[PDB]
Amino acid sequence: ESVKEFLAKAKEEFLKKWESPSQNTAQLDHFDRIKTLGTGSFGRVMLVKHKETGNHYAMKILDKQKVVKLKQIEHTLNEKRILQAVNFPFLVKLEFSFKDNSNLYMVMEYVPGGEMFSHLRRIGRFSEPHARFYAAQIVLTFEYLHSLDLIYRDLKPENLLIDQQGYIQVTDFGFAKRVKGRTWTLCGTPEYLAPEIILSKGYNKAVDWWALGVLIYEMAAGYPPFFADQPIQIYEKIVSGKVRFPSHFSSDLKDLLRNLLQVDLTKRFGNLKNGVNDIKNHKWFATTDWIAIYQRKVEAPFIPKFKGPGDTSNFDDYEEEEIRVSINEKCGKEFTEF
Ligand SMILES: NC(=O)c1ccc(C(=O)O)cc1
């Protein structure tokens, strides 16, 4: 009942913000630009500093014309409407949002420890306790999101940032969607796609639990389970129903992963009658105190090394490009609700 009442309140609070979203809560000239932290085909993330408060933020800047051309309109509206409505310890917080003639802006908390991916690749692989600490945070986060009828759809090591306490913050809601039944869009990253996405089926929240299986495997092995040189080869391995486990994996880990990496979505852990509890009660998680993780009372496996809230040393170097704002409004109609 404690969990039921927690999730009921969580849904109430989400729905109030979902139905009446915040809009236009800052503007670009309130910020100084510091450094580009990441870049893609239609957007970038920039470390910025608020000129009045001195606080640092990660500002995601999306070019409206490129969002339209790459068919990401609905996805970008999803991302902002969801982010302004959610609240969970392991989700990066949206602090402000706004738009101008050229761009959409989501001003997020800055997480200076960098991507889990960087740390994983530095050290090679995580021990099972270390992987389990991060995995438990994802389990709770998906329990939260799924209870709100949200599917995340972009789990991968690059999207898990490590905070100043060594805990995970999930970023990038670009593929997240409120889905009460099924959905159909081809999205994600190849190594993490569930078979039913590859096969163009109407799919549901079970794809997130598949992706958790991939993530746990990659954390504990150092490489993902369906690895191959080209996407088509990855996809063939994903749909095959076969996975090879390193001998160093524990039997408990292998058993959990066989149940998460279950090709038949109707037999996949997280999607059975007991829902998330088949995962939370699995022997691989027997040492996990779920409440203590939620309350951030567990000592983390490591604290990232950084000098302060403005340190960018855990992120990498990109060409610094202009944030140009056209004299004419672009795509105003498409982004009216942002
Ligand atoms: N909230 C952040 O600190 C944050 C940092 C980097 C990125 C990226 O490179 O996409 C995203 C978010």
Q: Long-range contacts made by residues 244-249, C-beta under 8 angstroms, separation at least 24?
A: 245/217, 246/220, 246/221, 249/128, 249/220, 249/221
The dihedral region occupied by 61, where left means phi > 0, alpha psi between -120 and 50, and beta the remainder, is beta
User: Is ligand 1 within 6 A of the CB of residue 86?
Assistant: no
Instruction: Give the integer Cα–Cα distance in Å for 124 and 48.
Output: 32
Residue entry with tokens 């099924």: 182
Elucidated via: X-ray
- Phi, psi angle pair for 160, to nearest 5°: -110, 110
Of all protein residues, the one whose alpha carbon is nearest to atom 9 of ligand 1 is 38
Which of 215, 98, 232 shows the shortest CA–CA distance to 160?
A: 215
Q: Two tokens at 97?
A: 């949002």
User: Is ligand 1 within 6 A of the CB of residue 45?
Assistant: yes
Q: How many residues does the chain have?
A: 338
Q: Two tokens at 52?
A: 């009045």
Spacing, Cα 171 to ligand 1 middle (Å): 7
Which of 333, 323, 338 shows the shortest CA–CA distance to 102?
A: 323
Of all protein residues, the one whose alpha carbon is nearest to atom 5 of ligand 1 is 58
Of all protein residues, the one whose alpha carbon is nearest to atom 1 of ligand 1 is 110
CA distances from 96 to 25, 33, 104 (A): 5, 16, 11
Spacing, Cα 45 to ligand 1 middle (Å): 6
Q: Confirm if 49 and 78 have CB atoms less than 8 A apart.
A: no
Which of 329, 337, 319 shows the shortest CA–CA distance to 64?
A: 329
- Phi, psi angle pair for 25, to nearest 5°: -105, 5
Residues 6+ positions from 2 with CB-CB distance below 8 Å: none
Give the count of alpha carbons within 13 A of 169, CB side only: 22
User: Is ligand 1 within 6 A of the CB of residue 310?
Assistant: no
- Virtual CA dihedral for 141, 90, 170, 88, nearest 10 degrees? 70
Q: Confirm if 159 and 109 have CB atoms less than 8 A apart.
A: no
Provide the annotated binding site for ATP.
37-45, 60, 109-115, 156-159
Q: What is the CA radius of gyration of the chain?
A: 20
Neighbours of 202 (CB within 10 A): 10
Resolution in units of Å: 1.4
If DSSP states are collapsed to H, E and C, what string results for the chain? CHHHHHHHHHHHHHHHHHHCCCCCCCCHHHEEEEEEEEECCCEEEEEEEECCCCCEEEEEEEEHHHHHHCCCHHHHHHHHHHHCCCCCCCECCEEEEEECCCEEEEEEECCCCCEHHHHHHHHCCCCHHHHHHHHHHHHHHHHHHHHCCEECCCCCHHHEEECCCCCEEECCCCCCEECCCCECCCCCCHHHCCHHHHCCCCECCHHHHHHHHHHHHHHHHCCCCCCCCCHHHHHHHHCCCCCCCCCCCCHHHHHHHHHHCCCCHHHCCCCCCCCCHHHHCCHHHCCCCHHHHHCCCCCCCCCCCCCCCCCCCCCCCCCCCCCCCCCCCCCCCCCCCC
Instruction: Give the integer Cα–Cα distance in Å for 98 and 127.
Output: 42
Active-site annotation holds for 154: yes
Strand ordering across the sheet containing 103-109? 31-39, 43-50, 56-63, 103-109, 94-99
Residues 6+ positions from 305 with CB-CB distance below 8 Å: 313, 314
User: Is ligand 1 within 6 A of the CB of residue 38?
Assistant: yes
User: Is ligand 1 within 6 A of the CB of residue 238?
Assistant: no
Report how far apart the first and last C-alpha atoms of the chain are (Å, whole number).
37
Q: Two tokens at 318?
A: 């990109």
Q: Which of 63, 149, 154, 255 is catalytic?
A: 154
Spacing, Cα 57 to ligand 1 middle (Å): 9
Indicate the top mutation candidate among 108, 159, 167, 317 to test ligand 1's pocket, ranked by most ligand atoms within 8 A of CB: 108
Give bridge partners of residue 304 from the DSSP assignment.
none
Indicate the top mutation candidate among 118, 154, 161 to test ligand 1's pocket, ranked by most ligand atoms within 8 A of CB: 161
Cβ-based burial of 320 (10 A; exposed 0-12, middle 13-18, buried ≥19): exposed
